[PDB]
Design an enzyme around this catalytic site. Structure first.
Site, short mmCIF file in Angstrom:
data_model
loop_
_atom_site.label_atom_id
_atom_site.label_comp_id
_atom_site.label_asym_id
_atom_site.label_seq_id
_atom_site.Cartn_x
_atom_site.Cartn_y
_atom_site.Cartn_z
N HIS A 47 0.76 -1.25 0.00
CA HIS A 47 0.16 0.26 -0.12
C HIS A 47 0.95 1.27 0.05
O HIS A 47 0.57 2.08 -0.56
CB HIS A 47 -1.07 -0.02 1.12
CG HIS A 47 -2.02 1.02 1.10
ND1 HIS A 47 -2.01 2.22 1.92
CD2 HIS A 47 -2.97 1.43 0.12
CE1 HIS A 47 -3.12 3.00 1.45
NE2 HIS A 47 -3.61 2.58 0.29
N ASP A 89 -5.75 1.87 -2.74
CA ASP A 89 -6.62 1.72 -1.57
C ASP A 89 -7.27 0.42 -1.81
O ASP A 89 -7.57 -0.33 -0.86
CB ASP A 89 -7.72 2.65 -1.26
CG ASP A 89 -6.92 4.08 -0.78
OD1 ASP A 89 -5.54 4.07 -0.41
OD2 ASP A 89 -7.59 5.08 -0.51
#
EC number: 3.1.1.4
Lengths: 122, 122
Positions: A47, A89
């Protein structure tokens, strides 16, 4: 933004980020400071790398547009940043979810102390 | 446990811990590694101190019993640990809430870099 990343985490995992993910392992739950401990942990690393690539963006504070109306996250329209940030995300939440199989409750609030030094590169 | 501390945060503040609190300032959002930046930040420091005192307890993983049925958190019965841990959590959530007045959205994901060294003692 992080608020949406958060909703995505929850939507996808059924677990609210805090404490299931924000305090997990050596990377999610330790500010990216340790080597991920497992898949779940690595999703946060991926991420950060993903946001890392969005140098021109404010991944954490730019509110993008997405839909999860039919149980699959679909990033909608927006600026290129928004869209890219949203993919990140999405990917991370999908990743958490895709790794509930090995999610270990005992990695929450894991002592930094057993955390080993970051060994992979984005 | 952290899950209940989390529900309390939300109940009391209307803000889910992630990202409003877990990524806030220099102490909440940086692993207790910086001097709190303001009230909100200091609540996490007080929270750690409070758990700090519960040496004999597993504040993070012991599930206590509380009620917020009438909008006020009431720690119920349990072991002394549970009760003490719950007070901590209550206190921290009350503290966040009591400090929504100065909560600054711009302290979320605050660069550790501007974070100054921990200067207070429990």
């Amino acid at each position: 933004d992080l608020w949406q990343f958060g909703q995505m985490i929850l939507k996808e995992t059924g677990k609210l980020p805090f404490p299931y993910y924000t305090t997990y392992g050596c990377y999610c739950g330790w500010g990216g400071q340790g080597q991920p401990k497992d898949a779940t942990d690595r999703c946060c690393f991926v991420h950060d790398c993903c946001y890392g690539k969005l140098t021109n963006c404010k991944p954490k504070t730019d509110r993008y547009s997405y839909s999860r109306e039919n149980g699959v996250i679909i990033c909608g329209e927006g600026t290129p940043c928004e869209k890219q940030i949203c993919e990140c995300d999405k990917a991370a939440a999908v990743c958490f979810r895709e790794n509930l199989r090995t999610y270990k409750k005992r990695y929450m609030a894991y002592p930094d102390v057993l955390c080993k030094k970051p060994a992979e590169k984005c």
